[PDB]
Amino acid sequence: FNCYFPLQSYGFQPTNGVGYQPYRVVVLSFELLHAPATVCGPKKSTNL
Amino acid sequence: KNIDGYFKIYSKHTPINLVRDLPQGFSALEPLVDLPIGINITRFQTLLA
């Protein structure tokens, strides 16, 4: 009694309205300028 | 070498004919590997077969 499961389910169905739908969210937690750069990427070169 | 978070491995291979000594002569070392690691290094050890 008054002892509920901590995990509760979503009502993900396509018939629900906007705001009740499954949303895939990704969070980027990249970090700055404290170690040698490991990914850089953006270089471009023109013709000779 | 280790400078500012970078490991530098510089090397050379040579064919040789000697008994138990190191020879006399000149040989440069070409740069081979740089690594951007970023850690403190104090001791080491090699490994044997």
CSV table of N, CA, C and O in Angstrom, one decimal:
chain,number,residue,atom,x,y,z
A,1,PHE,N,0.8,-1.2,0.0
A,1,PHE,CA,0.0,0.0,0.0
A,1,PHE,C,0.9,1.3,0.0
A,1,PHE,O,1.8,1.4,0.8
A,2,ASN,N,0.5,2.2,-0.9
A,2,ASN,CA,1.3,3.4,-1.2
A,2,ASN,C,2.8,3.0,-1.6
A,2,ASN,O,3.7,3.7,-1.2
A,3,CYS,N,2.9,1.9,-2.3
A,3,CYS,CA,4.2,1.3,-2.6
A,3,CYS,C,4.1,1.0,-4.1
A,3,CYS,O,3.8,-0.1,-4.5
A,4,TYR,N,4.4,2.0,-5.0
A,4,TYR,CA,4.3,1.9,-6.4
A,4,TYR,C,5.6,1.5,-7.1
A,4,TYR,O,6.7,1.8,-6.5
A,5,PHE,N,5.5,0.9,-8.2
A,5,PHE,CA,6.6,0.6,-9.1
A,5,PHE,C,7.2,2.0,-9.5
A,5,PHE,O,6.5,2.9,-9.9
A,6,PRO,N,8.6,2.1,-9.5
A,6,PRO,CA,9.2,3.4,-10.0
A,6,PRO,C,9.0,3.6,-11.5
A,6,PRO,O,9.0,4.8,-11.9
A,7,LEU,N,8.9,2.6,-12.3
A,7,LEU,CA,8.9,2.6,-13.7
A,7,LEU,C,7.4,2.6,-14.2
A,7,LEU,O,6.7,1.7,-13.9
A,8,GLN,N,7.1,3.6,-15.1
A,8,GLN,CA,5.7,3.7,-15.5
A,8,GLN,C,5.7,3.8,-17.1
A,8,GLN,O,6.6,4.5,-17.6
A,9,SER,N,4.8,3.2,-17.7
A,9,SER,CA,4.8,3.1,-19.2
A,9,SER,C,4.3,4.3,-20.0
A,9,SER,O,3.6,5.1,-19.4
A,10,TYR,N,4.8,4.4,-21.2
A,10,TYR,CA,4.3,5.3,-22.1
A,10,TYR,C,3.1,4.8,-22.9
A,10,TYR,O,3.0,3.6,-23.2
A,11,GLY,N,2.1,5.7,-23.2
A,11,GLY,CA,1.0,5.3,-24.1
A,11,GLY,C,1.3,5.7,-25.6
A,11,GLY,O,0.6,6.4,-26.2
A,12,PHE,N,2.4,5.2,-26.1
A,12,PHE,CA,2.8,5.4,-27.5
A,12,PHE,C,2.0,4.6,-28.4
A,12,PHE,O,2.1,3.4,-28.5
A,13,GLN,N,1.0,5.3,-29.0
A,13,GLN,CA,0.2,4.8,-30.1
A,13,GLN,C,0.1,5.9,-31.2
A,13,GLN,O,0.2,7.1,-30.8
A,14,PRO,N,0.0,5.6,-32.5
A,14,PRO,CA,-0.2,6.6,-33.5
A,14,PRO,C,-1.5,7.4,-33.4
A,14,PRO,O,-1.6,8.5,-34.0
A,15,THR,N,-2.5,6.8,-32.7
A,15,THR,CA,-3.8,7.5,-32.6
A,15,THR,C,-3.8,8.6,-31.5
A,15,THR,O,-4.8,9.3,-31.5
A,16,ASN,N,-2.7,8.7,-30.7
A,16,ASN,CA,-2.7,9.8,-29.8
A,16,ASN,C,-2.4,11.1,-30.5
A,16,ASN,O,-1.9,11.1,-31.6
A,17,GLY,N,-2.7,12.2,-29.8
A,17,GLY,CA,-2.5,13.5,-30.4
A,17,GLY,C,-1.1,13.9,-30.4
A,17,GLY,O,-0.2,13.2,-29.9
A,18,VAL,N,-0.8,15.2,-30.9
A,18,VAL,CA,0.5,15.7,-30.9
A,18,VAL,C,1.0,16.0,-29.5
A,18,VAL,O,0.2,16.7,-28.7
A,19,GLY,N,2.2,15.6,-29.2
A,19,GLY,CA,2.7,15.7,-27.8
A,19,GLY,C,2.6,14.4,-27.0
A,19,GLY,O,3.3,14.3,-26.0
A,20,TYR,N,1.9,13.4,-27.5
A,20,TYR,CA,1.8,12.1,-26.8
A,20,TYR,C,2.5,11.0,-27.7
A,20,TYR,O,2.2,9.8,-27.5
A,21,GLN,N,3.4,11.4,-28.6
A,21,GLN,CA,4.0,10.5,-29.5
A,21,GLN,C,5.4,10.2,-29.1
A,21,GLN,O,6.0,10.9,-28.4
A,22,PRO,N,6.0,9.0,-29.6
A,22,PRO,CA,7.4,8.8,-29.3
A,22,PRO,C,8.3,9.7,-30.0
A,22,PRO,O,8.2,9.9,-31.2
A,23,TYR,N,9.2,10.3,-29.3
A,23,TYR,CA,10.2,11.3,-29.8
A,23,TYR,C,11.6,10.8,-29.5
A,23,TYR,O,11.9,10.6,-28.4
A,24,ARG,N,12.4,10.6,-30.6
A,24,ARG,CA,13.8,10.2,-30.4
A,24,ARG,C,14.6,11.4,-30.3
A,24,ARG,O,14.6,12.3,-31.1
A,25,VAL,N,15.3,11.5,-29.1
A,25,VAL,CA,16.1,12.6,-28.8
A,25,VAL,C,17.5,12.2,-28.5
A,25,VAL,O,17.8,11.2,-27.8
A,26,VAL,N,18.5,12.8,-29.1
A,26,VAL,CA,19.9,12.6,-28.9
A,26,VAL,C,20.6,13.8,-28.3
A,26,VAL,O,20.2,15.0,-28.8
A,27,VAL,N,21.4,13.7,-27.3
A,27,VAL,CA,22.1,14.8,-26.7
A,27,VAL,C,23.6,14.7,-26.9
A,27,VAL,O,24.2,13.6,-26.6
A,28,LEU,N,24.2,15.8,-27.4
A,28,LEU,CA,25.6,15.8,-27.6
A,28,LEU,C,26.3,16.5,-26.5
A,28,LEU,O,26.0,17.7,-26.2
A,29,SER,N,27.2,15.8,-25.8
A,29,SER,CA,27.9,16.3,-24.7
A,29,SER,C,29.4,16.3,-24.9
A,29,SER,O,30.2,15.8,-24.2
A,30,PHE,N,29.7,16.8,-26.1
A,30,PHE,CA,31.1,17.1,-26.5
A,30,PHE,C,31.7,18.2,-25.6
A,30,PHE,O,31.0,19.0,-25.0
A,31,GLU,N,33.0,18.3,-25.6
A,31,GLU,CA,33.7,19.1,-24.7
A,31,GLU,C,34.8,19.9,-25.4
A,31,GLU,O,35.3,19.5,-26.5
A,32,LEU,N,35.3,21.0,-24.8
A,32,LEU,CA,36.1,22.0,-25.4
A,32,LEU,C,37.5,22.0,-24.9
A,32,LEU,O,37.7,22.0,-23.7
A,33,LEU,N,38.5,22.1,-25.8
A,33,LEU,CA,39.8,22.7,-25.8
A,33,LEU,C,40.6,22.5,-24.5
A,33,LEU,O,41.3,23.4,-24.0
A,34,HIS,N,40.5,21.3,-23.9
A,34,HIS,CA,41.2,21.0,-22.8
A,34,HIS,C,42.2,19.8,-23.0
A,34,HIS,O,43.1,19.6,-22.2
A,35,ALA,N,42.1,19.1,-24.1
A,35,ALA,CA,43.0,18.1,-24.5
A,35,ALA,C,43.3,18.3,-26.0
A,35,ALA,O,42.6,19.1,-26.6
A,36,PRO,N,44.4,17.6,-26.6
A,36,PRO,CA,44.6,17.7,-28.0
A,36,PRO,C,43.3,17.2,-28.8
A,36,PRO,O,42.7,16.2,-28.4
A,37,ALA,N,43.0,17.9,-29.9
A,37,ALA,CA,41.8,17.7,-30.6
A,37,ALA,C,41.8,16.4,-31.3
A,37,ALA,O,42.8,15.9,-31.9
A,38,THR,N,40.7,15.7,-31.3
A,38,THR,CA,40.6,14.3,-31.7
A,38,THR,C,39.8,14.1,-32.9
A,38,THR,O,40.2,13.5,-33.9
A,39,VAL,N,38.6,14.6,-32.9
A,39,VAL,CA,37.8,14.9,-34.1
A,39,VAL,C,38.0,16.4,-34.5
A,39,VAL,O,37.8,17.2,-33.6
A,40,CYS,N,38.5,16.7,-35.7
A,40,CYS,CA,38.2,18.0,-36.2
A,40,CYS,C,37.3,18.1,-37.4
A,40,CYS,O,36.1,18.5,-37.2
A,41,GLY,N,37.7,17.6,-38.5
A,41,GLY,CA,36.9,17.6,-39.7
A,41,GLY,C,37.0,18.7,-40.7
A,41,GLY,O,37.4,18.5,-41.9
A,42,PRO,N,36.7,20.0,-40.4
A,42,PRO,CA,36.2,20.9,-41.5
A,42,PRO,C,37.4,21.6,-42.2
A,42,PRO,O,37.7,22.7,-41.9
A,43,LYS,N,38.0,20.9,-43.1
A,43,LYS,CA,39.0,21.5,-44.0
A,43,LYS,C,38.5,21.4,-45.4
A,43,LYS,O,37.9,20.4,-45.8
A,44,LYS,N,38.8,22.5,-46.2
A,44,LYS,CA,38.5,22.4,-47.6
A,44,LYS,C,39.7,23.0,-48.4
A,44,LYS,O,40.4,23.9,-47.9
A,45,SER,N,39.9,22.6,-49.6
A,45,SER,CA,40.9,23.0,-50.4
A,45,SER,C,40.4,23.3,-51.8
A,45,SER,O,39.5,22.6,-52.3
A,46,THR,N,40.9,24.3,-52.5
A,46,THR,CA,40.5,24.7,-53.8
A,46,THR,C,41.5,24.1,-54.8
A,46,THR,O,42.4,23.4,-54.5
A,47,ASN,N,41.2,24.3,-56.1
A,47,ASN,CA,42.1,23.8,-57.2
A,47,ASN,C,43.4,24.6,-57.2
A,47,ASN,O,43.5,25.7,-56.8
A,48,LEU,N,44.4,23.9,-57.8
A,48,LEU,CA,45.7,24.4,-57.8
A,48,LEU,C,45.9,25.3,-59.1
A,48,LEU,O,45.5,24.9,-60.2
B,1,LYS,N,59.7,10.3,-27.0
B,1,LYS,CA,59.5,11.6,-26.3
B,1,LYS,C,58.1,11.9,-26.0
B,1,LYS,O,57.2,11.4,-26.7
B,2,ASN,N,57.9,12.6,-24.9
B,2,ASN,CA,56.5,13.1,-24.6
B,2,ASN,C,56.6,14.6,-24.4
B,2,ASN,O,57.3,15.1,-23.4
B,3,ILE,N,55.9,15.4,-25.2
B,3,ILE,CA,55.7,16.8,-25.0
B,3,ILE,C,54.3,17.2,-25.3
B,3,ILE,O,53.7,16.7,-26.2
B,4,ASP,N,53.8,18.0,-24.3
B,4,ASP,CA,52.4,18.6,-24.3
B,4,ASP,C,51.3,17.6,-24.7
B,4,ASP,O,50.4,18.0,-25.5
B,5,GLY,N,51.3,16.4,-24.2
B,5,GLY,CA,50.3,15.4,-24.5
B,5,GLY,C,50.5,14.6,-25.7
B,5,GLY,O,49.6,14.0,-26.2
B,6,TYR,N,51.8,14.6,-26.2
B,6,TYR,CA,52.1,14.0,-27.5
B,6,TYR,C,53.3,13.0,-27.3
B,6,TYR,O,54.3,13.4,-26.7
B,7,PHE,N,53.0,11.8,-27.8
B,7,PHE,CA,54.0,10.7,-27.8
B,7,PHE,C,54.7,10.7,-29.2
B,7,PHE,O,54.0,10.6,-30.2
B,8,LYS,N,56.0,10.7,-29.2
B,8,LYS,CA,56.8,10.7,-30.4
B,8,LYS,C,57.7,9.5,-30.4
B,8,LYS,O,58.5,9.3,-29.6
B,9,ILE,N,57.4,8.7,-31.5
B,9,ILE,CA,58.2,7.5,-31.7
B,9,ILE,C,59.0,7.6,-33.0
B,9,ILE,O,58.4,7.8,-34.1
B,10,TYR,N,60.3,7.7,-32.9
B,10,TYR,CA,61.2,7.9,-34.0
B,10,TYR,C,62.1,6.7,-34.1
B,10,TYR,O,62.6,6.2,-33.1
B,11,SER,N,62.3,6.2,-35.3
B,11,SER,CA,63.0,4.9,-35.4
B,11,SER,C,63.8,4.7,-36.6
B,11,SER,O,63.8,5.6,-37.5
B,12,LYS,N,64.4,3.6,-36.7
B,12,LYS,CA,65.3,3.1,-37.8
B,12,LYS,C,65.5,1.6,-37.6
B,12,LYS,O,65.6,1.1,-36.5
B,13,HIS,N,65.6,0.9,-38.7
B,13,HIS,CA,66.0,-0.5,-38.7
B,13,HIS,C,67.2,-0.7,-39.6
B,13,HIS,O,67.4,0.0,-40.6
B,14,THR,N,68.1,-1.6,-39.2
B,14,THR,CA,69.4,-1.7,-39.8
B,14,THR,C,69.8,-3.2,-39.9
B,14,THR,O,69.8,-3.9,-38.8
B,15,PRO,N,70.3,-3.7,-41.0
B,15,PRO,CA,71.0,-5.0,-41.0
B,15,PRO,C,72.4,-4.9,-40.5
B,15,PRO,O,73.1,-3.9,-40.8
B,16,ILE,N,72.8,-5.8,-39.7
B,16,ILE,CA,74.0,-5.7,-38.9
B,16,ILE,C,74.6,-7.1,-38.7
B,16,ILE,O,74.0,-8.1,-38.8
B,17,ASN,N,76.0,-7.1,-38.5
B,17,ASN,CA,76.7,-8.3,-38.2
B,17,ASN,C,77.7,-8.0,-37.1
B,17,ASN,O,78.8,-7.6,-37.3
B,18,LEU,N,77.3,-8.3,-35.9
B,18,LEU,CA,78.1,-8.1,-34.7
B,18,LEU,C,77.8,-9.1,-33.6
B,18,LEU,O,76.7,-9.6,-33.6
B,19,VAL,N,78.8,-9.4,-32.8
B,19,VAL,CA,78.6,-10.4,-31.8
B,19,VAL,C,77.8,-10.0,-30.5
B,19,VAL,O,76.7,-10.5,-30.3
B,20,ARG,N,78.3,-9.0,-29.7
B,20,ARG,CA,77.7,-8.7,-28.5
B,20,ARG,C,77.8,-7.2,-28.2
B,20,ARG,O,77.8,-6.8,-27.1
B,21,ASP,N,77.9,-6.4,-29.3
B,21,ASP,CA,78.2,-5.0,-29.1
B,21,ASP,C,77.3,-4.2,-29.9
B,21,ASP,O,76.5,-4.7,-30.7
B,22,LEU,N,77.4,-2.9,-29.8
B,22,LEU,CA,76.8,-1.9,-30.6
B,22,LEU,C,77.8,-1.2,-31.5
B,22,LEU,O,78.9,-0.9,-31.1
B,23,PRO,N,77.5,-1.0,-32.8
B,23,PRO,CA,78.6,-0.6,-33.7
B,23,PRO,C,78.9,0.9,-33.7
B,23,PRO,O,78.3,1.7,-32.9
B,24,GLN,N,79.9,1.3,-34.4
B,24,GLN,CA,80.3,2.7,-34.6
B,24,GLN,C,79.9,3.1,-36.0
B,24,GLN,O,80.3,2.5,-37.0
B,25,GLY,N,79.3,4.3,-36.1
B,25,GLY,CA,78.8,4.8,-37.4
B,25,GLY,C,77.7,5.8,-37.2
B,25,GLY,O,77.3,6.1,-36.0
B,26,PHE,N,77.2,6.3,-38.3
B,26,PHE,CA,76.2,7.3,-38.3
B,26,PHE,C,74.9,6.7,-38.8
B,26,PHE,O,74.9,6.0,-39.8
B,27,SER,N,73.8,7.0,-38.2
B,27,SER,CA,72.5,6.6,-38.6
B,27,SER,C,71.4,7.6,-38.1
B,27,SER,O,71.3,7.7,-36.9
B,28,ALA,N,70.7,8.2,-39.0
B,28,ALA,CA,69.6,9.1,-38.5
B,28,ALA,C,68.4,8.3,-38.2
B,28,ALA,O,68.2,7.1,-38.5
B,29,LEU,N,67.5,8.9,-37.5
B,29,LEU,CA,66.2,8.3,-37.2
B,29,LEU,C,65.1,9.1,-37.8
B,29,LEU,O,64.9,10.3,-37.6
B,30,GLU,N,64.3,8.4,-38.7
B,30,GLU,CA,63.2,9.0,-39.3
B,30,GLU,C,62.0,9.2,-38.3
B,30,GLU,O,61.9,8.3,-37.4
B,31,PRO,N,61.2,10.2,-38.4
B,31,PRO,CA,60.0,10.3,-37.6
B,31,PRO,C,59.0,9.3,-38.1
B,31,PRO,O,58.8,9.1,-39.3
B,32,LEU,N,58.4,8.6,-37.1
B,32,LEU,CA,57.4,7.6,-37.5
B,32,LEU,C,56.0,7.9,-37.0
B,32,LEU,O,55.1,8.0,-37.7
B,33,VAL,N,55.9,8.0,-35.6
B,33,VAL,CA,54.6,8.0,-35.0
B,33,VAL,C,54.5,9.2,-34.1
B,33,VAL,O,55.3,9.5,-33.3
B,34,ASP,N,53.4,10.0,-34.2
B,34,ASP,CA,52.9,10.9,-33.2
B,34,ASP,C,51.6,10.5,-32.7
B,34,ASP,O,50.7,10.1,-33.5
B,35,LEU,N,51.4,10.6,-31.4
B,35,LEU,CA,50.1,10.3,-30.7
B,35,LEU,C,49.7,11.4,-29.8
B,35,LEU,O,50.4,11.9,-29.0
B,36,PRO,N,48.4,11.9,-30.0
B,36,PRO,CA,47.9,12.9,-29.1
B,36,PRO,C,47.2,12.4,-27.9
B,36,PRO,O,46.0,12.3,-27.7
B,37,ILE,N,48.0,11.8,-26.9
B,37,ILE,CA,47.4,11.1,-25.8
B,37,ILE,C,46.9,12.0,-24.7
B,37,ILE,O,45.7,12.0,-24.4
B,38,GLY,N,47.8,12.7,-24.1
B,38,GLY,CA,47.5,13.7,-23.1
B,38,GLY,C,47.5,13.2,-21.6
B,38,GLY,O,46.7,13.6,-20.8
B,39,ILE,N,48.5,12.3,-21.3
B,39,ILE,CA,48.6,11.8,-20.0
B,39,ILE,C,50.0,12.0,-19.4
B,39,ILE,O,50.9,12.3,-20.1
B,40,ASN,N,50.1,11.7,-18.1
B,40,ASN,CA,51.4,11.8,-17.4
B,40,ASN,C,52.1,10.4,-17.5
B,40,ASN,O,51.5,9.4,-17.2
B,41,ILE,N,53.4,10.4,-17.9
B,41,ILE,CA,54.2,9.2,-18.0
B,41,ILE,C,55.4,9.3,-17.2
B,41,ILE,O,56.1,10.3,-17.3
B,42,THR,N,55.7,8.3,-16.4
B,42,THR,CA,56.9,8.3,-15.5
B,42,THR,C,57.8,7.1,-15.7
B,42,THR,O,59.0,7.3,-15.8
B,43,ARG,N,57.2,5.9,-15.8
B,43,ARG,CA,58.0,4.7,-15.8
B,43,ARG,C,57.6,3.9,-17.1
B,43,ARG,O,56.6,4.2,-17.7
B,44,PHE,N,58.4,2.9,-17.4
B,44,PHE,CA,58.1,2.0,-18.5
B,44,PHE,C,58.7,0.7,-18.3
B,44,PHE,O,59.6,0.5,-17.4
B,45,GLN,N,58.4,-0.3,-19.2
B,45,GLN,CA,59.1,-1.6,-19.3
B,45,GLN,C,58.8,-2.2,-20.7
B,45,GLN,O,57.6,-2.0,-21.2
B,46,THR,N,59.7,-2.8,-21.3
B,46,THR,CA,59.6,-3.6,-22.5
B,46,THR,C,59.1,-5.0,-22.2
B,46,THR,O,59.0,-5.4,-21.1
B,47,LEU,N,58.8,-5.7,-23.3
B,47,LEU,CA,58.2,-7.1,-23.1
B,47,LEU,C,59.0,-8.1,-24.0
B,47,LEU,O,59.5,-7.7,-25.1
B,48,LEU,N,59.1,-9.3,-23.5
B,48,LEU,CA,60.0,-10.3,-24.1
B,48,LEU,C,59.2,-11.5,-24.5
B,48,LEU,O,58.1,-11.8,-24.0
B,49,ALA,N,59.7,-12.2,-25.5
B,49,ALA,CA,59.2,-13.6,-25.9
B,49,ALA,C,59.9,-14.6,-25.2
B,49,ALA,O,61.1,-14.4,-24.8
